[model samples]
Target: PTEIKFSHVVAENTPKGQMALKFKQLVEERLPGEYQVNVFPNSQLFGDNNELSALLLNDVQFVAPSLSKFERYTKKLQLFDLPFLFKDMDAVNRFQQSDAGQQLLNSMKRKGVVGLGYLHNGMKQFSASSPLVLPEDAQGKKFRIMASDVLAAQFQAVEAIPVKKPFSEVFTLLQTRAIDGQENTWSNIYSKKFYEVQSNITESNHGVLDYMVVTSNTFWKSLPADKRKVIKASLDEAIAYGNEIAAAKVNKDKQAIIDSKRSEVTYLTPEQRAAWVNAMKPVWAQFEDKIGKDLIDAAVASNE
Candidate 1:
């Protein structure tokens, strides 16, 4: 069996980690003697900074990185980075699995990577050393981000400073007070122990924390037609299984954080959330035409 390396930057207990294991199990068990998938979890192989480059170089066969991370490769993906892009997870899942979503995934094909599909993580929440009770709380504060220019703008809209850094650096930076806060899902904050360093969390629900399952386009096309068919089928099934558990795990993980007493979770009232969403409207307006306002409208409507 040919060996395929699968790399990610989170612990094996993470959503990505669980999905990776599911994919490996289905592929290895169902296609024994055809392919062997070796999983490397928690930045053991490559972290956010180098995983995609490694995949592009064919150093690894598969990677599932956040959608916003693709901004460096194609601006089209910035659509996902927009604040309040989807009303809820249903809209996100609908759009990601929709024809338009397929187009966003396929946009990477010519750029050396082919997106298989999107896997749910959860909606992003904000964390800080202090309670972010008001929009001005972000003013002059430095927040960590991955690679979305639009995300930077999202913070800027509220007067916060945005710093693009790898996921591996975020924990250390937050721990040392080198960065004030960061945005992530509850699963990540609990699994990676980010809540240990941050004192407050606002359940912003401003955007999605979805990831894209992708493979090296060069390597994918190089596979025999029969093997390609089998591999794609296996991934599809694994992704479906992931979707089933993704929603349930969100609250479960948040409860874990609450039980740990590591941080305080705050939910903004309907009015407070509306204020933040309205403040970030410029972010949507900034890229509305480029990303197609109709697409954004459709996604929001899909939820309602």
Candidate 2:
């Protein structure tokens, strides 16, 4: 029997972890003795930040890294990290299934990663000790940012200082005021109890944070063609199920945060939200050269 190991960065209790578990079960049942899947959660085998490198080196059979990480290998993926690119959940799904989405997935082939599919990560929101009702409110505030130049650029565009830190360090950073705030989904904010450290929440809904399940091209090609087909089919099914769960969980998690009474939620009025979008527009121009204009145009066209 052959076994494939899957490494994930979240805790086993997280939605992503549970999705991986379901994927593992499905693969095991479908392939039986020919193939097996073992899941490592909470970065048991490697830090969340290192999973991409591990997969590239074939040190890990598979990794489902947040899309922001792809910025390291392909600047095009950083498009998703650009603040305010997605107007809503529907826009995100439509873009991802369009021609631009297919091109993004295809582009990974040249970068040594085979993108299996996209997984839902829910809409990202802002949390801080004070309300970030306007872009000026974020000025001078240190916000914990993912390790991506594009994301850093986005924060800088709004006059917010970007504090680079791994996800594991976020809680402590927020507590010590090392970082004044961070952006993430309600589920993550609630699960990590970021609300305990932050007194305010801004439902910025700037963009949808998505994850891509990828395997090393070397590892993928080494598998028999039939095996590859089976795995991809199983992953596609898992992706559908995961997206459904994520959509439902986002609302549930938001309610959980409200119930905790640890923080207050602030939503932007239509005009204020427009101001945010306007603030982030410069980020696209700043990185357009590195990210490729064709890719940018394709993504924008997908929305039309």
**Winning model by TM-score:** 1
Per-residue accuracy of model 1 over 1-304 as CA lDDT, tens digit each: 8999999888777778888899899999888998999999988999888899999999999998988888657767778888987878878888877777778878877788898888888899999988886687888999998778789989999999999998877889998999999999888888888999998999998888888989987899889999888889988887877766677778888998888898998889988888898888789888877767877776666676
Give the Cα lDDT of each candidate.
0.86, 0.83
The count of residue-pair clashes in candidate 2 stands at 0
Q: Name the lDDT of candidate 2.
A: 0.83
Model 2, residue 131: displacement in angstroms? 1.2
TM-score of each: 0.95, 0.94
**What does the lDDT read for residue 23 in candidate 1?**
87
Q: Per-residue CA lDDT of candidate 2, range 1-304, in tens?
A: 7878899867665667777888888999998998888999867887667888888888888888888887667778887886777777787788888877867776678879888888887889999999899988999889998788887888898899997777777888998888899999987887777889999999998867788888988999899999888888888887788887788778888998898898999988999988988998888888888878887776666555
**Which residue ranges in model 1 land beyond 4 Å of their true spot?**
none
Residue 262, model 1, lDDT: 82
